Paper text:
The type VI secretion system (T6SS) is a machinery widespread in Gram-negative bacteria and dedicated to the delivery of toxins in bacterial and eukaryotic host cells. The phage tail-related syringe-like tubular structure is composed of an internal tube tipped by a spike-like complex, wrapped by a contractile sheath and tethered to the membrane through contacts with components of a trans-envelope multiprotein complex. This membrane-associated complex is composed of the TssL and TssM inner membrane proteins and of the TssJ outer membrane lipoprotein. By combining interactions with inner membrane and outer membrane-associated components, the TssM protein crosses the cell envelope and is therefore central to the T6SS membrane complex. Nanobodies were raised by immunization of llamas with the purified periplasmic domain of the EAEC TssM protein (TssMp).
Two nanobodies, called nb02 and nb25, were selected for further studies based on their high affinity for TssM and on their amino-acid differences in the variable regions, suggesting they bind distinct regions of TssMp. The two selected nanobodies, nb02 and nb25, sharing 77% sequence identity, were produced in the periplasm of E. coli, purified to homogeneity and concentrated to 10 mg/ml. Both nb02 and nb25 behaved as monomers in size-exclusion chromatography and both crystallized readily, allowing to solve their three-dimensional structures by molecular replacement. The superimposed structures of nb02 and nb25 differ by a rmsd of 1.13 Å on 118 aligned residues. However, despite identical lengths, the conformations of the nb02 and nb25 CDR1 and CDR2 regions differ significantly. More importantly, large differences can be observed on the CDR3 regions, notably in terms of size (14-residue long for nb02, 19-residue long for nb25). Analysis of the SPR curves indicate that nb02, nb25 and nb42 bind to TssMp with KD values of 66.8±2 nM, 1.61± 0.1 nM and 1.76± 0.1 nM, respectively. Due to the 50- to 1000-fold magnitude differences between the KDs of TssJ and that of the nanobodies to TssMp, we expected that the occupation of the TssJ binding site by the nanobody would prevent TssMp binding to TssJ. The formation of the nb02-TssMp-TssJ ternary complex demonstrates that TssJ and nb02 bind TssM differently. The control nanobody and nb02 had no—or little—effect on the function of the T6SS as 17–2 cells producing nb02 released the Hcp1 protein and retained anti-bacterial activities at levels comparable to that of wild-type 17–2 cells. Because of the formation of an nb02-TssMp-TssJ ternary complex, nb02 is an interesting tool to assist the crystallization of the TssMp-TssJ complex.
Author numbering: 1 to 130
Amino acid sequence: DVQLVESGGGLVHPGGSLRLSCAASGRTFSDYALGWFRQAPGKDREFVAAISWSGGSTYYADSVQGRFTISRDNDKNSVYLQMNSLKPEDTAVYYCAADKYYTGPGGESVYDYWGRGTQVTVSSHHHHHH
């Protein structure tokens, strides 16, 4: 019956940073491995990052590795996704997911629990010089 809620989405200029959080209900949070997934406008959802029960093991999607960092704080029942040097291609609704039994890269369909999603828009001022 674990409930997940993401926060932190917003409109950011390219090169900008953004920090997302995903908080879980109850106090059995350490029993869950978590992941971040994202859905770009009208596309299939893709893997972003994953973190094990103890933050010991982490995985990143190839398009985000090095720019993004996933972390966890058991005292705040939360996982975070720190995004640096954002690109227009990072525009998506970001979702967090939880599972008591599996951790690793990908495995979207494996996760048992899902958040609501938080929107991340990476946009310039749309100024065109011709």
